[PDB]
Amino acid sequence: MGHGAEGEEHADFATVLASADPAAGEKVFGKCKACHKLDGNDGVGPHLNGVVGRTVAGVDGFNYSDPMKAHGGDWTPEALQEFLTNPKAVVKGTKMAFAGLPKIEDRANLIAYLEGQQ
């Protein structure tokens, strides 16, 4: 629904991830560096080095939104790619102002890169 682009030509997310390209993910992360670092520093968003498997809303000292704090669970690869599909829909009232990664391979490639940034 709606009059914007919605097709995907590269389409089971686990299958997409298993063949992902971490160097391509390293470039997708450029879209997140204004807010997120991979050296443990926190800023507009919390650091994302070691996010894969981390408790949701877990970074010490970072002031998360109410729906993020109340969510529970961990950032598994499925959780991460669901949230990155369209943050504002997937966690209504998130404070992350990012439109999303509609390309399924961009999500899988970005998750594969974050897996190597623990």
Residues of the binding site for heme c: 32, 35-36, 68, 96
Kindly state the smallest distance separating residue 118's Cβ from Zn ion, in Å.
9
33: left (phi over 0), alpha (psi -120 to 50) or beta: alpha
Token pair of 48 as six digits: 């994302």
* 78 contacts Zn ion (rule: CB under 5 A): no
- Cβ of 75: how many Cβ atoms within 10 Å? 20
Q: Looking at 1-9, 12-20, 62-70, which segment touches ligand HEC (CB under 6 A)?
A: 62-70
d(CA 40, CA 66): 23
Map residue 74 onto helix, strand or coil.
strand
Q: Which of 17/56 has CB closer to ligand HEC?
A: 56
* 94 contacts ligand HEC (rule: CB under 6 A): yes
* 89 contacts ligand HEC (rule: CB under 6 A): no
Ranked by CB distance to ligand HEC, the top (closest) residue is 32
